[PDB]
Design a protein around this nucleic acid. Sequence first.
DNA 1: GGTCAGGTCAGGTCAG
Length: 596
Amino acid sequence: MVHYYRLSLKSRQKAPKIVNSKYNSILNIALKNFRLCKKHKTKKPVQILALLQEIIPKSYFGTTTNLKRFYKVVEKILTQSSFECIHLSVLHKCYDYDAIPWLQNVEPNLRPKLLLKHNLFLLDNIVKPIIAFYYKPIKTLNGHEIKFIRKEEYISFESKVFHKLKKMKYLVEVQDEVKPRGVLNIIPKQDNFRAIVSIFPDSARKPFFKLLTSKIYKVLEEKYKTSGSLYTCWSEFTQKTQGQIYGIKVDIRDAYGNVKIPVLCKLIQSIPTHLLDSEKKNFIVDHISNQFVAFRRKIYKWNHGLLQGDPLSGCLCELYMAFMDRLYFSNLDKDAFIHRTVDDYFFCSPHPHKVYDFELLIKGVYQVNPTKTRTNLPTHRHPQDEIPYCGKIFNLTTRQVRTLYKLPPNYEIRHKFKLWNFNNQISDDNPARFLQKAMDFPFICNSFTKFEFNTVFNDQRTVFANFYDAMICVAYKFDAAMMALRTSFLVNDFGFIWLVLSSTVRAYASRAFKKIVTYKGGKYRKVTFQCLKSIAWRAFLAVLKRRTEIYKGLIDRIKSREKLTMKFHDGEVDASYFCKLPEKFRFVKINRKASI
DNA sequence: GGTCAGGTCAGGTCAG
Ligand SMILES: [Mg+2]
């Protein structure tokens, strides 16, 4: 029931020195050259595609066309998304068997199963081992993007920060062979790093941490006031306040690191025992008071607040903060608006000084990330009217809220979609299920919420541009799914794709009706079912034109007619925004090419 | 057969 090959490096095996007796012995030539390659110092930067060429004999493929086929896969590995797969079927389908010298002697009907396992063998024992030999994959947490870094480069940074963390007494090496709970990892961010712990999956102790986590969330919702609902807080405050809003979003740097463990331990003990048993209280207290971590064959103690990566760290930091909130922000104007996440505070009032004071009140208590601070206060050095917060972009003047998109310039957008599922594999002769699973709704739902489609505080200018931006995204996902159909399913019948295409602009457009209509408000003008299906079909237009040659046929019949009149009842929806591509998505790389 | 309540999964958003 296994159709898929996973691209990621840790699926790699460790190469025998000699090839097994069911494999043809041209392979042993390759393994020998593999060792010779590893003994090369390789101080200077070198491409993997180039290094493999001088390892795998041309004599193994015969023709250059066969070889480029196999390089299309190495490149995919070198450019992989987390979880990305290919079909095992590609490893052999459509090859020029004639040109393969060592198969003339093997019966034709026997050849494809020899080539798949020989290509599996080369991929598992030579290609990934070598990539691993020179680099480390780190996941950027922008979608599933994985960046590869040179081992000499990463190691240097690792040791560099490790020495800092050893200087700053955050990490202290002791001698008791106390059990470490996980392995520390140093993963670089924008300017800093992130020290995190990977918990050894514990021996049936996770259920215990699940239980404790729920039990303290019960104390959070109880002895501490609710922090709002965000959608309702921003609804009410924009109605209670009619003048120019003033606001600030501040980003605390290292919320975990700046927790005072002692206080947290006193909060723990302070719980009523009908709520939290004294034994459990004490388990958390020496759990977070004794955080031990394995580095390079050494076990250290973590004492800078809470360990990112520990299962308790989240909820325990929540408790800490909720208690702080009581201390410092309970008395604020009732009319003003305030909402917090884990380390992101958003505060709005119609008076400049109340926000300015809030900035001071917060700075007296916390060390913040000053570059991350955003404000419309006129005496700030870079004031703005739009504040990013919580995955949304609030405009304090207009009071219109958009979705926030995390797509750096040259981000390869295929990294924002997990199209492969290894627990539920799709056949190579069933591309229809591979293009529909791509099209499941749940993936854009977080942009199909009361927040984006309501017309309570939102114009129609903005309830439109929202739905339009969401659909640009579903398009890019469609394009990535297509090139997975093209490059892994290898389909040439593009007739069973239009089905789910229009079969989702209908449901995709209709959902915006029930969700958009249930949250009507005083800026609601008039929206229309085919106004939405037309926005949708013009979004696909503006996107698909980026690979016009593969797609003009589909855009030819689309553009031709379709009644793209684009009449809008409001009149202040420019509608120019809909023809073309919103600036965010034009500068995203849609092609796949391994840099090194 | 038609609801609910609970459980799982999936892909996505938050945020460490
Ligand atoms: Mg933050």
